[PDB]
């Protein structure tokens, strides 16, 4: 709520407690759906926490931090006296003032981060804790965290391209609702959301997103289903990067029209492929990093990958 980002209003020494309102699964229960045994599981939950927007005035594009209950084995073994699990960050998926501007909650899009044969081998601590939350449970929170990945704070006319993979879709749900419905600013540009995942059933919030597309014209939705589609260029898996190449003109519109690029999701450093595809389109032949830093400097690039 209330524009202008604040960070670290809550640290591990003064956490913020939040009660769980809802925690619903968004992907097929294990065994159902397209992902075969040998490829493990893709269990993605949508999690809604009740908070006091007065005490936790977050801004969409920011991250919330969670502290999983318990003692970190590695820390105890190293004997740290801290021992408590270190914070895990998650992209806030709800719009600044919540859906319907009720200012009553905050939401996350979290996936069980396991390893896996097809059977489980290692089990992510925090992601599973979250996905195991029951309505009424209390969550230890930190933040807000981050103040770079943000929307314009004044009226905007340039086009905006959202590039997401998997859970990276989170920030773009809130941002999409805020730009198209909440209108905290007069936005007159075109939104292009390029969203990628392994299987069609692992694309989450689709009903909502497709609905956004049919209601606006202001908003186009493209998907890259990597394990069901091959790109037309090299016949490899279809990634969002290949979609960018197909959207050469929407890309050019942004490069020359003062638009913005938001890239979010995994795996770590997945922005490289997307960025150097944008560079091909611009035709600029500087080094990858010279082009990337230029865009960021020009406020036309925003990247959060993990
Ligand atoms: C800015 C930011 C935003 C993020 N947003 C989201 C988001 O919106 N949604 C989301 O789901 N995640 C998001 N993440 C990731 C999140 O922060 C966590 O890193 C992630 O959920 C996994 O945390 P974990 O505690 O469950 O995994 P950890 O317990 O820290 O384990 C990490 C990985 O290591 C593996 N592992 C554990 N033990 C071993 C071992 N002995 N040998 C080999 N491997 C092992 C685990 O299986 C796991 O896959 C974000 C991260 C960042 C930095
Ligand atoms: N277990 C792994 O080592 C592994 C495997 C794939 C990606 N990531 C996954 O990404 C995180 C989230 O998983 P999720 O179930 O929410 O969905 P997801 O596995 O993250 O899928 C996101 C999409 O990005 C694609 N991709 C992989 N490398 C890329 C690059 N360099 N440039 C552009 N796109 C790329 C993936 O294609 P693919 O069909 O080739 O994966 C996938 O379709 C992690 O949990 C991790 O599982 C790492
Ligand atoms: Zn509308």
Residue numbers in the entry: 7 to 122, 125 to 314
Sentences from the paper on this structure:
LepFNR·NADP+ crystal structure, refined to 2.70 Å resolution, revealed moderate structural changes when compared to LepFNR crystal structure. The high quality of electron density maps, allowed the unambiguously positioning of the NADP+ molecule noncovalently bound to the C-terminal domain of LepFNR. Small, but distinct, structural rearrangements could be identified upon NADP+ binding. Tyr247 changes its side-chain conformation and bends toward the NADP+ in LepFNR·NADP+ crystal structure, thus facilitating interactions between adenine phosphate and its side chain hydroxyl group. NADP+ binding also causes changes in Arg245 conformation, which also is part of the NADP+ binding site. NADP+ molecule is attached to LepFNR C-terminal domain by a network of hydrogen bonds. The phosphate group is anchored by the hydrogen bonds with Arg245 and Arg235. At variance, in LepFNR the nicotinamide portion of NADP+ makes water mediated hydrogen bonds with Asp119, Arg41 and Glu210. The overall structural adjustments induced by NADP+ binding in LepFNR structure are modest, and RMSD deviations between NADP+ bound and NADP+-free states are of 0.453 Å as calculated for Cα positions only. Here, the position adopted by the NADP+ nicotinamide bound to the LepFNR enzyme may represent another intermediate before the productive binding of the substrate.
